[PDB]
Design a protein around this ligand. Structure first.
Ligand SMILES: O=c1ccn([C@@H]2O[C@H](COP(=O)(O)OP(=O)(O)O[C@H]3O[C@H](CO)[C@@H](O)[C@H](O)[C@H]3O)[C@@H](O)[C@H]2O)c(=O)[nH]1
Ligand SMILES: O=c1ccn([C@@H]2O[C@H](COP(=O)(O)OP(=O)(O)O[C@H]3O[C@H](CO)[C@@H](O)[C@H](O)[C@H]3O)[C@@H](O)[C@H]2O)c(=O)[nH]1
Ligand SMILES: O=c1ccn([C@@H]2O[C@H](COP(=O)(O)OP(=O)(O)O[C@H]3O[C@H](CO)[C@@H](O)[C@H](O)[C@H]3O)[C@@H](O)[C@H]2O)c(=O)[nH]1
Ligand SMILES: O=c1ccn([C@@H]2O[C@H](COP(=O)(O)OP(=O)(O)O[C@H]3O[C@H](CO)[C@@H](O)[C@H](O)[C@H]3O)[C@@H](O)[C@H]2O)c(=O)[nH]1
Lengths: 290, 290, 288, 290
């Protein structure tokens, strides 16, 4: 029932700038594979069949990653390395497509999502910020939970993890009665994007995983351009709360912010240890560093 | 209402090959604009809102043509040339989106169209072979008629032009009782892809302008492994006459084939003479030759 | 011996839009091939062997067009379409190097040529403005005549041809004693960039072909902004006339500006009919 | 003086995949910046001024990286964010040329260097293999010590360092007389490429740093296919040992091979800990692991 996911990938480097000058930020190397792939595989493992990149004129390498590469496939045959020729050809199942739409100017997430309007058309869709990875564990992943919850509830889902009270100006924050338990979704009565430390309806941060009705697209057309002169998505959610019901899902798994260079280095260490091939030999390389 | 049009643009440019080596065949510059624009501007003027490009890894320029180019815009401002600036920022109306999707391998026109099965969904959609221009006259354009005619008839429409009985080798050809009149569509009881010049149910060529129900995507999914090297669209329309009705609309327009190097030149001369600004200088420029 | 040409291909194509919006102006298809080709088939046919490109971020399409396109070669090799494989595989003969250096910002045709400084070193060199095609004359190509004339006179060559006195507005103009003859060179007293219509020393415009000494790089190092706050090559050709004799070669051939929207359409018409395989049938299309 | 360095980057990254599937192995991000930087910033800091790149159609992003980025630049002078501008603008000193010549087919690391003949001309040149990083904490960089030793001795330098007696069949190993000392040369009798684990002159591997006379280009033009159907450099380095004294400079620094998956991980740890802005907090994150 929820099949389409929007990834906004149209932002320039800035946050990440020397690395992401001449290649996209989304494409920077986490252990051995670009960040974007952790995001796509997350969607995929939740029954997402249509990936809708909202991309910029300079992000061809994201499109090409999920596409076949004649010169590289034939070099991987002429060297008889049918090993990788499988990993570089099945990056994504055959039933899963990948769709490119352009943001004309970087007028912010809200505008970005609104560019995937014509593709999403009439269906209820997920949104995954590809700045954020979401390492899970036993059984399903967090996004799989939210969709099935969206299905039975028919109420927009919005992932939330609790953060230090001072990093609250950095994230969007949800107004909630009591915070819900890991893996469950308590109704929410308000949301705000740039809340100054102490002026926070709670400590529960918007993680960057959503599930939203195609209404949100007509709402995005008619949101004011506030929160830093940019059209904000979390404003369009507030306008949905005026009529439709919106819940805050608490995730079970830990996140990572590959926006911040520091947050990226954290994702390398943690994914570099959970790595099923070098995870252990990596651990050994850390110990012997001092 | 038929809104989505599919432009298969995934083919390398083998026919056009010194020119299209290092830029798409579709970006080949007719008078002063790329061929692809003439095609898109034909779709747009028939209430197409969604341009679905089935593209290759190389055909970046095509996507970028319908997007905004900061570097160029800002030099058109820094130079006072507000002339061009509106021409290159409004290549299409803003209600018109341009979606993009990848043909993993070149397995034929049919497999290209099938590649947009997800972007098309359940909506009846047009197909426009972008290596073929369709200069019209007064009132509205040809594709306009076909779509109005599809909507009322609910039966697939397939543009047909009369061609000499020896060039039947080089086209798809339709089977009709009586040949229809310019601007009207008689029913058709058969289609052939590459029938050998003399064994053809008529002299009516498939022009490469279609309107097709979403249904045809599941047929494409189960077409014989090709009529030639690869999977053919015309084959998938044979399997449509097995259940639904298919009509042949006879165009009232004159066409050009920018696939053949000689067809390209023909079009340069024709669009070059009908040019609002250069048109008559061009005439005077041709007249001056030995 | 003159070996290294220096094509400045770093300018966006504001003059030819929307054609050159997504592609470079140089890859504007003329009959059945990019423009740059014709200009590089000029350099080579006059014994140039190191085509230096001063390019931009946005102009990979040029560098790719003078290199092997793997997916295209292997598809054509398999299908045994040796005709079309011919047209892509040997564009410039195997001995011809094609070199890239980026013009970081576009501060003018001078700054442009001064970006090829390190790669030219101490070698005397030609400059071809790709925006402008020159059409092969009887046997010899105009550029060969110039190179061998610098190779004898050791004095810089500057290709020139007449223009209507009112269009002299928008070229470099050269001052002359006896007005040099068709295929002849003749000493000059000075050069000036985009001079005002009336009060310009002649009707002879700088075409876009030069042969210079590697001395010019140290003149261009000094030469200040002299047009749109833009470093000019002419303003360094001035500074050269100060010390060493400079000449003005006059065109034996015929020329097109693909800068102009009309100049393009003219080049497509001429090269059109003169085309080996297509000219014959093309000549028929016209008459209809 | 020695002023030109010849970086061969025409390889695809089959060794580091799917890292390099859509971005050059050279633009694989170490800590916060592409690998190639470190190599180029190592050449610069030994008075290299013309960084020649032998490159491939896929390697546009290298040439863009050592060039101005009009959108990024103006969109940083906008928010007056001079820190990040600092990072993209003078990545290498203003006095440094960066040249691009294309390697038509990948016929080997000799054929690669021979493609840069018409630009090295008659001048003696360094060659930096970009896959191999060299961290030089001494104060002077291993390449300055080498360039001044060729200057003084006029003898073709070759960086070498010790590798376990197994895994000698990866590198090209040298034939050392008196076994040279840390950061100083010793004349070598011969050199062989990827020799069998057993038939090994020494345990001293060719690292990837070389300083060579433009004699090589005339040798390289007349050496046949060595190991695989590849024109080795090591084989042309032998053909110079036949006539001129060739020395074997021993590493003082510490290397990494981003060719290998661990080499990368190890470089992202080391360069990571000795990072200015991140060292202190990265050191913090490694301690927070368990
Ligand atoms: O015009 C734009 C602007 C942004 N982006 C993308 O948007 C994502 C993140 O948006 P950004 O503007 O960086 O905002 P954040 O600071 O990441 O804040 C967002 O993400 C937070 C979690 O990281 C949430 O808490 C907030 O609600 C949400 O606004 C990135 O992947 C960008 O590439 C676009 O594609 N186009
Ligand atoms: O795998 C492929 C093959 C082709 N194309 C593109 O799709 C079009 C197909 O044209 P082409 O491959 O040359 O086929 P044609 O020989 O033109 O045949 C088609 O076009 C005829 C009219 O031009 C019709 O009458 C036929 O029914 C139809 O099969 C071109 O624009 C190609 O670039 C793709 O995108 N993918
Ligand atoms: O910073 C720059 C400026 C120009 N160019 C290129 O140089 C060529 C010519 O530059 P342009 O500014 O178009 O030249 P003009 O302003 O027309 O002036 C030159 O071109 C005329 C040819 O038409 C000559 O008559 C003039 O004397 C000569 O100075 C073009 O291909 C540009 O792309 C660059 O690469 N970088
Ligand atoms: O046709 C070619 C072949 C190689 N390369 C590049 O050359 C570099 C080094 O060559 P590569 O083939 O990756 O390594 P090997 O050739 O296996 O080994 C090289 O590197 C070893 C150290 O890693 C040395 O000991 C060897 O002498 C040297 O040949 C790589 O970045 C390649 O991209 C090219 O650009 N073009």
């Amino acid at each position: 029932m929820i099949k389409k996911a929007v990834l906004p990938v149209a932002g320039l480097g800035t946050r990440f700038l020397p690395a992401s000058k001449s290649i996209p930020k989304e494409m920077v190397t986490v252990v051995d594979r670009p960040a974007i792939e952790y995001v796509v595989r997350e969607a995929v493992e939740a029954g997402i069949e249509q990936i809708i990149l909202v991309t910029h004129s300079s992000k061809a390498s994201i499109e090409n990653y999920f596409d076949r590469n004649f010169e590289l496939e034939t070099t991987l045959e002429q060297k008889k390395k049918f090993d990788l020729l499988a990993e570089i050809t099945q990056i994504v199942p055959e039933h899963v497509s990948v769709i490119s739409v352009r943001q004309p100017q970087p007028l912010g997430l809200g505008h970005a999502v609104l560019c995937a309007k014509s593709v999403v058309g009439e269906d209820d869709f997920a949104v995954l910020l590809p700045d954020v990875l979401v390492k899970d564990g036993s059984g399903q992943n967090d996004l799989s939970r939210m969709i099935s919850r969206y299905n039975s509830s028919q109420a927009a889902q919005i992932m939330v993890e609790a953060v230090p009270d001072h990093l609250v100006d950095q994230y969007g924050i949800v107004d909630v009665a009591q915070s819900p338990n890991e893996g469950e979704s308590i109704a929410m009565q308000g949301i705000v994007e740039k809340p100054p430390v102490g002026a926070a309806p709670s400590n529960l941060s918007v993680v960057g995983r959503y599930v939203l009705p195609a209404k949100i697209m007509q709402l995005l057309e008619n949101t004011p351009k506030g929160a830093g002169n940019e059209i904000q998505l979390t404003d369009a959610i507030a306008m949905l709360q005026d009529t439709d019901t919106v819940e805050a899902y608490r995730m079970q798994g830990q996140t990572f912010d590959c926006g911040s260079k520091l947050g990226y280095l954290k994702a390398v260490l943690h994914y570099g240890l959970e790595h099923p091939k070098l995870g252990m030999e990596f651990k050994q390389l850390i110990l012997e560093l001092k």
